[PDB]
C-alpha cells in the first residue's frame with residue numbers, strides 16, 4: 134500500500150511538491166533562547182535552532198543553553214534528543230547533556246570532515262591513551278574500545294563525572310558512509326545500522342533518550358528518527374499501511390524545525406520504511 138503510494142509519487146515525479154507541502158504545513162514556535170546574543174557561539178547554523186518549548190536545558194550553574202531538542206513521539210512511545218554536531222566550545226555541554234539526560238547511546242550520522250569541510254568537532258577521543266577532559270562541565274571521556282565495520286563503527290566510551298567519580302558506558306554508533314551528495318541509493322546499510330542501534334538497547338525506555346546528531350541535527354538525523362518511528366508504528370497498528378509518513382514527519386517537526394532537509398531525504402525515508410517493514 135505505502136509501497137504503491139511510493140510508486141505513484143515516483144511516476145508523477147512529485148517528491149519536490151510533497152516535500153514543499155510539508156515545509157509549508159510545518160509548525161512554527163519561538164526560539165527566543167537560541168537567538169539570545171549570549172548564545173551566538175553555541176549555534177553551528179544560525180538558521181537551525183531548537184524551539185523554546187522542547188529545548189534541552191543544561192543543569193549546572195551556568196548558561197543552560199545547548200542546541201538540542203527533545204522529540205517525544207507519544208503513539209510510538211519513543212523519545213530522541215536531536216542535536217547539532219558539537220562545536221569546539223560546546224563539547225563539554227554535549228557530554229553534560231548526555232550525563233544529565235541519562236542517555237546510553239549517541240548516534241552520529243556524519244563524518245567530522247565531509248567533502249573536505251568540517252561538519253562537527255572531534256568530540257570523542259580517537260585514542261585510548263589520550264582521554265578528553267571537559268573542565269567546564271567536569272567530565273572525563275575515555276575510549277575503551279571500538280568495533281570498526283565497513284560502513285559504521287561502534288565505540289565503547291567511558292564517561293566519568295569527575296565530581297562524583299561515577300562512570301557510565303556510552304555506546305557511540307557512528308554511521309561513516311553517508312554519501313557525499315544525495316542519499317544512499319539503497320537503504321540496506323542504513324537499516325542494518327538502525328537495527329544495530331535497536332539491538333543495543335540504546336533506544337529502550339530503560340534509560341534516557343538516545344542522542345542523535347549529524348551536522349545540523351535535522352537532515353540525516355531526521356531521516357534516522359523518522360524511519361525508526363514509522364517502523365515502530367507499523368509493528369504496532371492493526372492496519373500497518375495506515376502509517377502516514379508525512380503526518381509523522383509533521384508531528385516530529387512540532388519538536389524541532391526542519392527535520393528532513395531535501396526531497397531526496399524524504400524519498401529515502403519512505404524507501405527505508407518500506408524496506409525495513411519487510412524486515
Ligand SMILES: O=C(O)C(=O)Nc1sc2c(c1C(=O)O)CCNC2
Pocket residue numbers: 178180181243252347348349350351352353354394
Ligand atoms: O548533516 C546533516 O544532515 C544536516 O542536518 N545538515 C545541515 S542542515 C542545514 C545546514 C546543514 C549543513 O550540514 O551544512 C546549513 C544551513 N541550513 C540548514
Ligand SMILES: [Cl-]
Pocket residue numbers: 169170171172
Ligand atoms: Cl544575551
Ligand SMILES: [Cl-]
Pocket residue numbers: 243244245246
Ligand atoms: Cl569522522
Ligand SMILES: [Cl-]
Pocket residue numbers: 219220221251252253254
Ligand atoms: Cl567544528
Ligand SMILES: [Cl-]
Pocket residue numbers: 156390391392393394
Ligand atoms: Cl525545512
